[PDB]
From Swiss-Prot, chain B:
Source organism of the structure: Homo sapiens
Family annotation (PANTHER family): CHYMASE, KALLIKREIN-RELATED
GO molecular function, one term: serine-type endopeptidase activity
Name this protein carries in UniProt: Chymase
Principal location listed in the UniProt entry: secreted
Transmembrane residue ranges: none
Family statement: Belongs to the peptidase S1 family. Granzyme subfamily.
């Protein structure tokens, strides 16, 4: 319930945010507080905020 | 800290190094500062599952007799913190035990016009593509008019300070979050966020706004 996948590319503008490519997977560390979620990239190992509207849950969308 | 210099060891005795255990994977790190024997101030975005604070450090990879390494028992993240805007990026950490006040470990006193020179310290990256620093670094930065932060969509001058002359490369950066901005020897700001490319200014939480909230937490705990 914490494994999510990027639907689009994203270039971070704040240093607290992750950049990512479409198809990149994440473990969500916190679903907020707000519309950006704290996540760890399973590609890079880095942690940061990602916009929640750019990701979808992996297990249910196959 | 980009564009700064290594601190004289133990010359900034309020500085705290935070190691934060996350829900998944390895820990993250942040700065912070001791404000009471059992309270550390930092940024809200440094929260996690559990936090260990190291006080008395210079080189964070070299244990010394000055170290006091303490577990956090309670995280008091500002209740209006929001990840979209990063407003209210402030958190108080209650330590499991009180720190011993020594020459190497102490509290930072509290009491600000644009144009004045301030200082910030941390273990963060020393350039955009550089690793964090093992040693505590510090840099002198100019407090800017809020207009200098106009490109930050969610900047709010009542809540935040705009810090760092944009014509220089000097700045706080990744890993420095939570550290204090000192102007004339007293805490005025907390490192919050800035551009991914490290071009100043960066955005700092304006401590003065949060004094009532801090005081209520301190009085109750």
């Amino acid at each position: 319930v914490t494994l999510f996948v990027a639907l689009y590319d994203y270039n971070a503008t704040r240093w607290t945010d992750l950049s990512f490519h479409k198809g990149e997977k994440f473990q969500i560390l916190e679903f907020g507080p707000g519309d950006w979620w704290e996540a760890r990239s399973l590609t890079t190992g880095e942690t940061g905020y990602i916009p929640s509207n750019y990701v979808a849950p992996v297990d249910s969308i196959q | 800290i980009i564009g700064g210099t290594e601190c004289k060891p133990h010359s900034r005795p309020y500085m705290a190094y935070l190691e934060i255990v996350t829900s998944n994977g390895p820990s993250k790190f942040c700065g912070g500062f001791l404000i009471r024997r059992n309270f550390v101030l930092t940024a809200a975005h440094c929260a996690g599952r559990s936090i260990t604070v190291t006080l008395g450090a210079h080189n964070i990879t070299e244990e010394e007799d000055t170290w006091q390494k303490l577990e956090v028992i309670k995280q008091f993240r500002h209740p209006k913190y929001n990840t979209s805007t990063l407003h209210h990026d402030i958190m108080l950490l209650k330590l499991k035990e009180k720190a011993s006040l020594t020459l190497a470990v102490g509290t930072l006193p509290f009491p600000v016009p644009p144009g004045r020179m301030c200082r910030v310290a941390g273990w963060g990256r020393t350039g955009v593509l550089k690793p964090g620093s093992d040693t505590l670094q510090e840099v002198k930065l100019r407090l800017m008019d809020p207009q200098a932060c106009s490109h930050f969509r969610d900047f709010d001058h009542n809540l935040q300070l705009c810090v760092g002359n944009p014509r220089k490369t000097k700045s706080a950066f990744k890993g420095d979050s939570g550290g204090p901005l000192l102007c004339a020897g007293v805490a005025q700001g907390i490192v919050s966020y800035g551009r991914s490319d490290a071009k100043p200014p960066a955005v700092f939480t304006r401590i003065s706004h949060y004094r009532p909230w801090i005081n209520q937490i301190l009085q109750a705990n």
